[PDB]
Amino acid sequence: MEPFGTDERNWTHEEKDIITRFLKYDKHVNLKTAEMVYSAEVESAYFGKAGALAGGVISALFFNFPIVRNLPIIRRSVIGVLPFLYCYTWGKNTQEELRWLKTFAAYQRFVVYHGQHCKLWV
Amino acid sequence: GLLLGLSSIYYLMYVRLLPFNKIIFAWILVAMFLYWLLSGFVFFVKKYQYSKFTAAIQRFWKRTYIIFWVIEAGTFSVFFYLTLNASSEPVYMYDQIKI
Amino acid sequence: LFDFNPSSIKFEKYPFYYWINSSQLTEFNQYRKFVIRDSIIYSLNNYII
Amino acid sequence: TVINSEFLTYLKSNYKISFSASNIVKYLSDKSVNNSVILYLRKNKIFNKSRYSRNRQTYRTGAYWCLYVNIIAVVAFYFWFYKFTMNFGYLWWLLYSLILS
Amino acid sequence: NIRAHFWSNFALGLLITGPIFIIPFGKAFRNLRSGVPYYFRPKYVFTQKNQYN
Amino acid sequence: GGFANFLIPYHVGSKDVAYPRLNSIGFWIQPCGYILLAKIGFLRPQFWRYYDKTSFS
Amino acid sequence: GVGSQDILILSVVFAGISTTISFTNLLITRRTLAMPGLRHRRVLMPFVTISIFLTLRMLATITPVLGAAVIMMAFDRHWQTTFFEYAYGGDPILSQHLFWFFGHPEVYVLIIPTFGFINMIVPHNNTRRVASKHHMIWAIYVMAYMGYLVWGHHMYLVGLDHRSRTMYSTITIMISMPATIKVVNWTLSLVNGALKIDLPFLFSMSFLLLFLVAGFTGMWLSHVSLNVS
Amino acid sequence: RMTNTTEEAFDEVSHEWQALVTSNPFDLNVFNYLENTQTSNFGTVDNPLVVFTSETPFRYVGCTGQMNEDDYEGHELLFFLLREGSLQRCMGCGQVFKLVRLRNEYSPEMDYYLSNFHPYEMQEMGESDTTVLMSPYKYASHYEYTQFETPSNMVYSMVNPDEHDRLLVDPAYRMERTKALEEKYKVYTSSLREVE
Amino acid sequence: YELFVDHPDLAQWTGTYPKVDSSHGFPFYSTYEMYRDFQENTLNSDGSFAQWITL
Amino acid sequence: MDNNYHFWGNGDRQDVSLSYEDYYSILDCLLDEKLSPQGLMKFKNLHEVSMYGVSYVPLYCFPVAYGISHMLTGKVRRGHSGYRNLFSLMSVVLPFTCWYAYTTPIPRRLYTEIICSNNADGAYVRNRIKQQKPGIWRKLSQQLYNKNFRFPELNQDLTATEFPLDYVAPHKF
Amino acid sequence: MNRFFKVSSKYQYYKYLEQYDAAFLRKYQSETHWYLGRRGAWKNLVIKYAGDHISLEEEHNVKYKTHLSFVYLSYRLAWVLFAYVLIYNHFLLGDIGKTFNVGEWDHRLKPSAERDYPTRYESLYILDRTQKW
Amino acid sequence: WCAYFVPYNIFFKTHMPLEHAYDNLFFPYFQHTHFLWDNNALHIPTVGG
Amino acid sequence: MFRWLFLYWYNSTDTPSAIAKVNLWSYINLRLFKARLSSSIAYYILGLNNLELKKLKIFYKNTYFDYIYLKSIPCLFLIIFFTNLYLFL
């Protein structure tokens, strides 16, 4: 149903959220596709939480690293938060990536279920 | 290195609940396999350290390298050929979407 | 290099803006089963207004 | 190098040069001679009469590696496709040979 | 008919393109990039380029 | 195995072969394939006979 | 079912690996470690060595095909890849084609060295030169060539297209041309010499007599209607 | 890319380098390429075919007879064990072979057979910076290329093994002998220039 | 002749006979064994019947 | 200005320009049922010319990639010796040069007659590109309005009572 | 020509450096002779003698040989298992159930197989595991 | 972090593949489990080594 | 540096025995580089007294494109003439 091509606009955050909530709660979605979206939502949050927690744990140690512990406060804080920022970004990006990939798979399943893709037929 | 490797090995064994005797037998066999291959290669390196690496030996090992890679690419060539002209249902009624 | 080049600027902040449903501007010559797509587009626009 | 005039005259009188030098070193100038590296080649008794080096005449690691390959093939195939494992306790004295070894 | 026209034009282009393009192209081989006159850099066979040019 | 490994060094005129290690390897890996391919008439997963009361074990 | 069939498939994989090792070791020897005068003149080597090298090259060509076929069979058995299930794309005829592409060159690998054995024994006892060693070498080499275009005479009935079937039949019937050259050369090697009757010579005569029958019966098997029957 | 023979060439590498830099028949006969042996003359009584052996009492020699352009070989391949001591002839074609047992020496006799050997190719000598050419067209014609140059400023001096060991463990003696050999090389070059 | 003198290996690959004249008695510094399969596996040589069958 | 101005695969400087990629994308939003036999013939001719062209495009990019790959290696010409690095850098760069070539619009008479035709076939093609390929139609309409083409489907239509379906790029009035 | 000025070491053996042109030393202690300059190459001789004899073929790495415990374990196991394979496949195929044990382990996703028990303990334990995904 | 923590969590703590696992594979989307692969656990010695 | 093998082997004072008395083997004097023929055909006939070394050289290897262009003009004009004659007839 979506336009296809290089010039086409990539899926925005609002479009992704709308399509996710459509797949979760609509009446025209079969139980398998809705279960796919639900399982996507269930497993994804752990990745963001774990990324944030691991970044917080590492940056607590990295704040006292042999060179970092002997730097002026501003540079010490920036270098210490660099692991936290990287790990938090990794967790959030991985959570969003997993959730959106399985949601897009569910969207493809919905489209094929209702025959809304040309050049796709049984 | 030993800490990480042994912890990973024990974690995988624990999560898969493998039969210890059978897996230890299989892993001993595979360890002997790999160890003796690598030991032969180490023998070659150590003996070619001095007084053994002539032009004939060098050309022999270059030929060995090219022959091994030609052997490896031989079966891969057949698999790639099969992949190119892969079998499919007739285009008329069975599989009209493969176009 | 040295002539007119079409601009690639496009609307970037309106959801499903380029999910264009058929009308008199599109001649109604789309894929036949896209009526469900048009209905979904209508519902999404009524949601986002 | 500078050759003494008396020595050169003595050499000219005693020996008359009649044939040219086939060595290419005659063309070398002093800069090329001074820019040369001296390398050493130890000359000892020769026993290997082939362009290939001496080859070890026993492959014990190879023999045992092939024995292990045979064991792997037979045991793994029987355990996978037949699900059969050899009952080593049937020949307990062979197993005891293994233990006592 | 098209073949006859094409081969007439091909011979004519061999006549024309040479002195306009190829012969001046030879002027690019008188010397090398560094300015030293052209010499022989072999690939594998050290051919005896004994003749003049 | 036999005739090639015996005659190629003779007829071609080579000291042993190019890979004596590979020659030994081939010979000592032959027996496993022989055993696997020759005893399928004695072996099958249904190893028990028709009068073996499988209901006892 | 799971068992002997899988054993056979993986044992064929292992046999292909062993054949790879064998022909690698043997062919690198003649190309690299040959004596200075017999690097490329194959007409000077004994006919058993010429035949062995030809069969090693043939095995080098067909071992990857056989390995691919058996690997596909194993995948179909244990992964349900449906390589030979017609319902969704596969075809068993592909498996037959692969195996017989390996198949006939294997039998030609098996038979040719015995030609070397007889071509060595007969001149030795007859203390005379063989009839035509060059022509026999070229006959076995063209037989090896034709071995890669006659693999389909084992698949006459499986329903191959008539174009392919006729190609297989016409290239198979012409393999009688090289073999008769071998027979004539052996017969002419037996004549006009000082015969020294040994025990290997009688085995050579038995081999010739046996090869006369099997060859013409196999040629009869290329008759399409007879092969159908 | 050329081996520093002062520290690395001991027995086989050392003998190969000696063959390369001297063309001494014995050494050369050890490392002659198996691909080709120089086409010698037909063996007669007055001009026997010389078969070289590097201090080995015998050698397997095959004979095919009077080679022709029509067919490359004259008669069938016949092998025999050519032994040291006297002229021995293939009776199939009456070809006389002489087994010359080359000795590890620099006698003029050894220099007599200097023209019966291919010069030792140095393309494969030393380490190579290319494993093998992945070219279907150049596999049988070209050796591996090199990104580096081959120096030509090396002068080789044979040294007795024990002395060579003292070269490796006594750097002062090594420098002394190297300086003396450089002086001798200067003297030799000056003498050659004077002769010219 | 130029191919044989300058690129002997390639010359051998072509089945070319050593073209250097050695009537003076000194053998050439780089000769080779003949490789005549190309000129033997022909419709004009000993491999005539085999090449006819392949043709 | 070649002598073969009649050729359908040929084109002048100001013909309608479509980059190969776009052309292929255009093939994904059309059906042969809706097209007349003349439109089908146009599309078949375009397919023939386009398959030959896409075959030939990497070759055109070879000298540019060959030069760029050499300049990445350095200022040394190790012909037959620097082949490994040269061809690795080529396997990298030649895709980029072909990317630029394939994303570069090229004029063609088939392009200018398939899109800009008064008949129902051209109207159908324009409407399908407008609805199913919004960005492709956006840039194509920007190109067409500068070539004195006036169609109801163009976003740059000043005589239309219906609002445009897409953003209108800046242009001279 | 710049001569080595002087050597300040009390070791009188090092005084040889003062007798040569620095470039000369540069030629025979650096560049080509860098891995040999001013060093007693005893280790070269030791390694050459190590590599030219007929020593223990079992090598672990460059520095060390394979451990004797590992070598002997491998050899004993190989010989005994090869003997077992030969004897069982040539003599003891008459009654498979007497000479072979049926054993099997499968994926934890599937239910535990009937033959997934510790052999030699069928009379004491019956083994099962909870499935996983 | 990169070689142990990241692979562990995306291999054993989820069944959803990441984009780089299948973006070039023309397979339908599917999940993967650690407990239906490599019955003969040759991956354990490989990973440990 | 020799072109003719016989010359190379007539009076060779670089033979190892001589070099054995100084023990200085220059890398620049490898026999592989000592002799190389002229890549032009050289064959021996029987002269009035002894062998005569006749040289066969058929064509030069220093031809430049301009020469190639000057001799190709008649061929190109012949092609043009024949094509136009076919068109007229």
Ligand code: HEA
């Ligand atoms: C080494 C083994 C070997 C050799 C040499 C051959 C040689 C030949 N074989 Fe084959 N063949 C097999 C092994 C061999 N074969 C096997 C194992 C199978 C079955 C595989 C399977 O299905 O299980 C098979 C199957 C087989 C078939 C399939 C039969 C069928 O399944 O329908 C055919 C038919 O085309 C055939 C033909 C030939 C031909 C035409 C030759 C020719 O090469 C032979 C020609 C030789 C001669 C012609 C020389 C004889 C000389 C004469 C002068 C005879 C004249 C003399 C008198 C009449 C007295 N073979």
Ligand SMILES: [Cu+2]
């Ligand atoms: Cu057959």
Ligand SMILES: [Zn+2]
């Ligand atoms: Zn003779």
Ligand SMILES: [Zn+2]
């Ligand atoms: Zn070459």
